[PDB]
Scaffold this active site. Structure first.
Site, PDB file in Angstrom:
ATOM      1  N   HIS A   1       0.809  -1.216   0.000  1.00  0.00           N
ATOM      2  CA  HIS A   1       0.000   0.000   0.000  1.00  0.00           C
ATOM      3  C   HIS A   1       0.845   1.270   0.000  1.00  0.00           C
ATOM      4  CE1 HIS A   1      -3.127  -2.899   1.181  1.00  0.00           C
ATOM      5  NE2 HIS A   1      -3.992  -2.007   0.737  1.00  0.00           N
ATOM      6  N   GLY A   2       2.076   1.172  -0.491  1.00  0.00           N
ATOM      7  CA  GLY A   2       2.894   2.351  -0.717  1.00  0.00           C
ATOM      8  C   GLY A   2       3.533   2.976   0.509  1.00  0.00           C
TER       9      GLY A   2
END
Ligand code: CDL
Ligand code: CDL
Ligand code: CDL
Ligand code: PEE
Ligand code: HEC
Ligand code: HEM
Ligand code: HEM
Ligand code: FES
Lengths: 98, 81, 74, 96, 378, 49
Positions: free
Chosen positions: A63-64
């Site tokens: 999710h970065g």
């Protein structure tokens, strides 16, 4: 993660109040050139990528998420900082953990 | 010990009782039954309800305030400008 | 193949999702949303996120949609 | 599971055997999760591998939009709208 | 000379059941105690069948549960009558304690204290049992609640590891809890026999609170059918709750398999422990919430000492009744607060609700008991 | 960040207190599961029975 002194510099340099999960850098690791951390991200259990990210620390593809070289979270969804295992150096070549 | 043969003394208190089969299991239900339950409710009502009513106001407030605490995210950015 | 039949299918989810947007609640939520968007565009380093107003729009939106969709589907 | 993460940018697709009764709001969480894929809001940005589904709690699901019209042709001969597809999916998962 | 009075076994059935005098004027609330016994009888046998299929290991437990819910015949009915039967057991139990707080049944102090011991044993039982499913909620519920023992100053962690059987919750711990949760209820039955044993030599209390020797009644013809009506209504509520909406009272996001790596977003204890949880979460400092957690249940023993009214039954003392229902509303406040994520609006109400919960049972009640003593010129 | 949007309730056939699942929908939904779903989702506890 044994690490370069420059990362110790950039980690010490960061403002403390700005952090999503504040925690002083030198106060964490017993010796700044070494950083021992649980390899699981604190958000949804994905494993952060070593030697990556904007800070040159850690990054989580799931999710970065962006962790710093000290493993503190900054950018991204993840709430609190990567957990620090209890451990101790014994003989200089060895390190007991847990 | 405290068997029926030996309990409290009591003296000439006569009593009367019909057989179960001699009488209806639902005597005067409407004329006396319902109004009795109503009188009972009217007695308990003011004693019981208001604290619960107080609870509800707090319950409504807490959720609503929490809504102001969170859902009013735009108030903070609005503060940003 | 033929685009038309694809054109023909249309889908009933979309059509319903527009008629609810036609209603006034979704309209005011929509214009307020676009207002938030333009305000976000206004400055180089905004902290504001319009996702909240987007929820304000979508909640009543899809809520209004909920009354009418399975009425169309079998 | 580790291979599943490798195939999905580290993300692990949850078992669907109890996916309905696990999530809050139950299967209602599911249909709306599939039916809804709004384009990303102005002023928010995210990794290209991430996809913006508002009903997802992280609001950036790793899953690519699984379905669209005529991804599959029902043997029943019923029309294959993505709405009917997601509906049948939620029904089958609910039974599952 | 009836056969029941000659047979040494029948004498116990004769005194404990068929012929013990009871007050005539007993109401619906006194049924609940008997219901508890029945609930136990239901919590055992039903649960016993689950034991025939459940496998207490870190890996096989959850799969064994799927095995019960599906491959096993009628297994889901058993699992739901069991899991909801426990919550029914706490409904009946809380009401059962509440009538004692109301009608002044606490003056039977020894029976009161034994009842408190049954309460604590019931809490350890249900708690160790909730860990068995080994769902997402279970691993972290046991994790946090066992992390509470970390607080004790000297024993601290060493004690916690002694419960875990390791450095973290794992299979051996799950087996521990399988055994203890399997054994405690059978202790609860014996202590319940002690409970009735300290109860029956004095006789049951009546709602008026006046001694009722003048109008005692044999238990059988009347209270066997009255209690039978109570059993039937109990089965009504339970069978409806299980066969119509089994999971409303249960917690979703328990079904996901436990991840040590991942913490669920809300993580809360199931509701019947949950009010006490606030008394934890509201109080600052890790140890003070533990001591408050102990006092929260242990006050009940302190309550009979605090009695000051010259009467007994609450019904003749309305000013006390107002405080009583106020306190019940406070309990509902604690439950709804414990059902919610941390935030200032919740934490403030939790502080107030906790402090009010203690002040009502320590300070307020005796004083208005005195005032009521003086209103009637005593 | 902000809590996720709360999904709207729907007029499902089985949400009636006595109403049952429609098996044709279960069939068609399984036929959806075999392709689009099955490629990247396990179902550990369901057999072909
Ligand atoms: C989940 C929760 C657990 C299950 C529900 C609670 C347990 C029920 C129970 O054990 O008590 C039965 C008990 C049977 O009567 P009882 O044996 O004479 O009990 C002693 C009375 O307290 C003697 O006191 P009383 O004579 O003053 O009567 C107290 C009662 C007056 O009510 C009654 O006396 C009997 C009511 C039952 C009538 C049945 C109606 C049709 C079914 O006052 C109230 O009910 C409060 C008014 C608001 C309720 C209105 C609807 C009630 C019907 O009924 C009650 O006292 C309480 C009933 C209220 C239920 C909740 C309604 C919403 C508020
Ligand atoms: C484990 C549970 C530990 C607590 C035992 C509670 C049961 C004792 C009892 O019911 O006393 C009757 C006594 C009533 O009889 P009583 O007229 O007052 O005369 C007392 C003597 O039992 C009148 O009979 P007694 O004068 O002949 O007393 C001598 C007899 C007294 O023994 C008993 O009273 C019964 C004890 C065994 C009950 C049968 C077990 C069935 C399962 O002693 C023995 O039988 C030898 C001891 C055997 C029990 C040893 C347990 C630990 C090993 O207490 C009650 O009010 C009965 C309610 C207690 C709970 C019963 C409800 C569930 C059953
Ligand atoms: C017929 C349908 C029966 C429905 C259930 C029966 C009663 C249910 C109940 O809770 O009452 C307590 C009942 C025993 O009390 P009781 O002897 O029937 O009431 C005292 C007598 O009524 C002696 O007091 P009473 O002479 O004043 O009784 C008169 C009155 C008051 O009776 C009561 O005290 C409450 C019971 C009223 C039932 C009326 C059902 C009407 C529907 O009963 C009525 O007839 C009320 C009139 C309502 C109009 C009737 C037609 C409806 C329109 O059952 C229990 O032991 C409570 C169990 C609580 C545990 C359940 C598990 C918790 C979850
Ligand atoms: C979370 C959800 C969990 C569900 C659990 C349900 C427990 C909530 C109980 C609330 C019930 C409210 C209905 C009250 C009905 C009522 O007011 O009855 C009136 C009646 C007055 O009757 P009389 O004194 O005879 O006067 C006659 C006048 N002529 O009052 C009573 O019945 C009082 C006796 C009932 C006691 C039961 C109270 C139930 C509350 C239990 C919680 C409190 C226990 C705290 C112990 C916790 C320890 C860990
Ligand atoms: C490999 C492509 C892919 C396909 C196609 C796909 N999934 Fe997913 N799905 C994933 C991944 C990866 C996740 C994990 C999301 C995350 O980690 O953020 C996910 C998440 C989910 C979720 C929600 C999980 C949550 O936490 O909310 C559900 C429900 C689900 N999948 C079921 C389905 C259903 C129904 C379909 C419809 C055919 C489907 N999957 C198709 C990969 C896929
Ligand atoms: C498994 C748990 C329990 C069981 C099986 C049980 C059983 C019983 C039974 C059958 C009675 C007879 C009167 C009635 O039924 O109302 C009774 C009375 C009593 N119980 Fe319990 N009980 C339990 C828990 C408790 C608890 C938790 C308390 C107190 C906190 C308690 C305190 C009392 C008191 C004070 C009485 C006296 C009632 C009277 O004299 O009328 N009990 N118990
Ligand atoms: C007062 C007594 C008891 C209470 C309150 C109680 C309560 C519970 C609870 C709350 C659960 C969790 C189930 C779930 O959440 O799905 C459970 C599970 C279980 N119990 Fe009990 N229990 C009691 C006694 C017993 C007894 C006597 C046995 C065996 C003889 C038993 C065997 C089991 C087993 C095998 C499970 C696992 C099944 C499952 O988790 O669904 N329990 N119990
Ligand atoms: S999994 Fe680590 S950020 Fe979502």
């Amino acid at each position: 993660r044994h690490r370069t002194q420059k990362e110790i510099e950039q980690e010490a340099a960061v403002e403390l109040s700005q952090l999503r999960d504040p925690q002083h850098d030198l106060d964490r690791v017993k010796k700044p050139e070494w950083v021992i951390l649980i390899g699981v991200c604190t958000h949804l259990g994905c494993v952060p990528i070593a030697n990556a990210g904007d800070f040159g620390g850690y990054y989580c593809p799931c999710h970065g998420s962006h962790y710093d070289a000290s493993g503190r979270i900054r950018l991204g969804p993840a709430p609190l900082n990567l957990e620090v295992p209890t451990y101790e150096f014994t003989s200089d070549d060895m390190v007991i953990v847990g | 010990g405290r068997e029926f043969g030996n309990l409290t003394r009591m003296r000439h208190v006569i009593s009367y009782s019909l057989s179960p089969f001699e009488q209806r299991a639902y005597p005067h239900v409407f004329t006396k039954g319902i109004p009795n339950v109503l009188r009972r409710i009217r007695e308990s009502f003011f004693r019981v309800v208001p604290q619960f009513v107080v609870f509800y106001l707090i319950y409504t407030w807490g959720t609503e305030e929490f809504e102001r605490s969170k859902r009013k995210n735009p108030a903070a950015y609005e503060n940003d400008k | 193949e033929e685009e038309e039949e694809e054109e023909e299918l249309v889908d009933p989810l979309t059509t319903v999702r527009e008629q609810c947007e036609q209603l006034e609640k979704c309209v005011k939520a929509r214009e307020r949303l676009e207002l938030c968007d333009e305000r976000v565009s206004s400055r180089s380093h905004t902290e504001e996120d319009c996702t909240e107003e987007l929820f304000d729009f979508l909640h009543a939106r899809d809520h209004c949609v909920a009354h009418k969709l399975f009425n169309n589907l079998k | 599971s580790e291979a599943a993460r490798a195939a999905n940018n580290g993300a692990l697709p949850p078992d669907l055997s109890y996916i309905v009764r696990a999530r809050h709001g139950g299967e209602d969480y599911v249909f709306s999760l599939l039916t809804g894929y709004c384009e990303p809001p102005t002023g928010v940005s995210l990794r290209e591998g991430l996809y913006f589904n508002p009903y997802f709690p992280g609001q950036a699901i790793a899953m690519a939009p699984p379905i669209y019209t005529d991804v599959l042709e029902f043997d029943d001969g019923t029309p294959a709208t993505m709405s009917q597809i997601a509906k049948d999916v939620c029904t089958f998962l609910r039974w599952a | 000379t009836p056969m029941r009075k000659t047979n040494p076994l029948m004498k116990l059935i004769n005194h404990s059941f068929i012929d013990l005098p009871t007050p005539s004027n007993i109401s619906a609330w006194w049924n609940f105690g008997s219901l508890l016994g029945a609930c136990l009888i239901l919590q055992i046998t039903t649960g016993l069948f689950l034991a025939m299929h459940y496998s207490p290991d870190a890996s096989t437990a959850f799969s064994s549960i799927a095995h019960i819910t599906r491959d096993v015949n009628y297994g889901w009915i058993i699992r739901y009558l069991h899991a909801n039967g426990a919550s029914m057991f706490f409904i009946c139990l809380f009401l059962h304690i509440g009538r004692g707080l109301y009608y002044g049944s606490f003056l039977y102090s020894e029976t009161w204290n034994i009842g408190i011991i049954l309460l604590l044993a019931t809490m350890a039982t249900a708690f160790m049992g909730y860990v068995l499913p080994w769902g997402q909620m279970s691993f972290w519920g046991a994790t946090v609640i066992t992390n509470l023992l970390s607080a004790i100053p000297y024993i601290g962690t060493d004690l916690v590891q002694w419960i875990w059987g390791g450095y973290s919750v794992d299979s051996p711990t799950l087996t521990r809890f399988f055994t203890f949760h399997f054994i405690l209820p059978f202790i609860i039955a014996a202590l319940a026999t002690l409970h009735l044993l300290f109860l029956h030599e004095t006789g049951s209390n009546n709602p008026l609170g006046i001694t009722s020797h003048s109008d005692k009644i044999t238990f059988h013809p009347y209270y066997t059918i009255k209690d039978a009506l109570g059993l039937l209504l109990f089965l009504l509520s339970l069978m409806t709750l299980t066969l119509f909406s089994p999971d409303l009272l249960g917690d979703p996001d328990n079904y996901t398999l436990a991840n040590p790596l991942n913490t669920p977003p809300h993580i809360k204890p199931e509701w019947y422990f949950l009010f006490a949880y606030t008394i934890l979460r509201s109080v600052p400092n890790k140890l003070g919430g533990v001591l408050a957690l102990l006092l929260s249940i242990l006050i009940l023993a302190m309550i009979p000492i605090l009695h000051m009214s010259k009467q007994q039954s609450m019904m003749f003392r309305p000013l006390s009744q107002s405080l009583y229902w106020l306190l019940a509303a406070d309990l509902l406040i604690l439950t709804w607060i414990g059902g919610q994520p941390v935030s200032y609006p919740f934490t403030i109400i939790g502080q107030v609700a906790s402090v009010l919960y203690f002040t009502t049972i320590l300070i307020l009640m005796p004083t208005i008991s005195l005032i009521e003593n003086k209103m009637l010129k005593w | 960040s902000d809590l996720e949007l709360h999904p709207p309730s729907y007029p499902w056939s089985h949400r009636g207190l006595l109403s049952s699942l429609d098996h044709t929908s279960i069939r068609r939904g399984f036929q959806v599961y075999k392709q689009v779903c099955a490629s990247c989702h396990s179902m550990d506890f369901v057999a072909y029975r």
